[PDB]
Design a protein around this ligand. Sequence first.
Ligand SMILES: C=CC1=C(C)/C(=C/c2[nH]c(/C=C3N=C(/C=C4\NC(=O)C(C)=C4C=C)C(C)=C\3CCC(=O)O)c(CCC(=O)O)c2C)NC1=O
Length: 240
Amino acid sequence: LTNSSLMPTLNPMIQQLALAIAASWQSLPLKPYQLPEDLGYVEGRLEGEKLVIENRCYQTPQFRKMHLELAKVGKGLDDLHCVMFPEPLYGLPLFGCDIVAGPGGVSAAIADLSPTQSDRQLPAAYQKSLAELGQPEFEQQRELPPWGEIFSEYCLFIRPSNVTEEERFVQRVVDFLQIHCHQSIVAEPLSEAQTLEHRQGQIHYCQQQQKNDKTRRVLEKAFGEAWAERYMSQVLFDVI
Ligand SMILES: C=CC1=C(C)/C(=C/c2[nH]c(/C=C3N=C(/C=C4\NC(=O)C(C)=C4C=C)C(C)=C\3CCC(=O)O)c(CCC(=O)O)c2C)NC1=O
């Protein structure tokens, strides 16, 4: 991230999360993942503010696509988006996070390990490890929208109320990533029927994420409807 144009000007929580995700990935058996049109940096404006986006994307044998996106709209909204899309053959859950900030601080902090099984449960090893972290206390919880039925019972969706909560959130994401990277070493390839189940779950996850009109409006204000539809369906939440 030392080469990032956006990092130096992003919200401090976002900065720490970007670093933590990058650190988690740094020693993995990474290969490039080429986004559509080999996208890296992109910017656009229409009648209002400009949107700037920096994309990084990788893959490993366990993760089909590892995408970390940083964005800023003018000087007033920052975002971090990250999804680790699993390879269905290994049946791992989906790691995701979305952090939205403005000049008055973080407005939304979301992180999850989301199920891909038909029964909408995380694998047993994840349930146990997540349970062992304890129920975190956050003063300003937010209710997920209906499309957010895709998220697990361990999903965080808050407005951080103070620095202690920002740090607690980051630490919880660090803990999710630690659990996830360990489970990815002990996963073994699944049966064809199980693989198919997990593929289904990942498709559903992407279709539901595409219902997020708050993201879509940010993109549309800078690039227009057609661009935004392509971005959400081909770059952010591609249906496999
Ligand atoms: C260019 C990329 C990008 C942008 C611009 C973006 C913006 C964005 N996401 C938001 C919400 C949100 N974002 C999520 C969740 C997620 N979203 C994800 O991309 C992932 C991976 C998850 C979860 C793992 C949810 C649940 C909300 C709240 C939606 C709502 O309030 O209706 C919001 C509203 C913030 C608020 O209400 O305080 C904005 C502006 N998200 C992005 O990804």
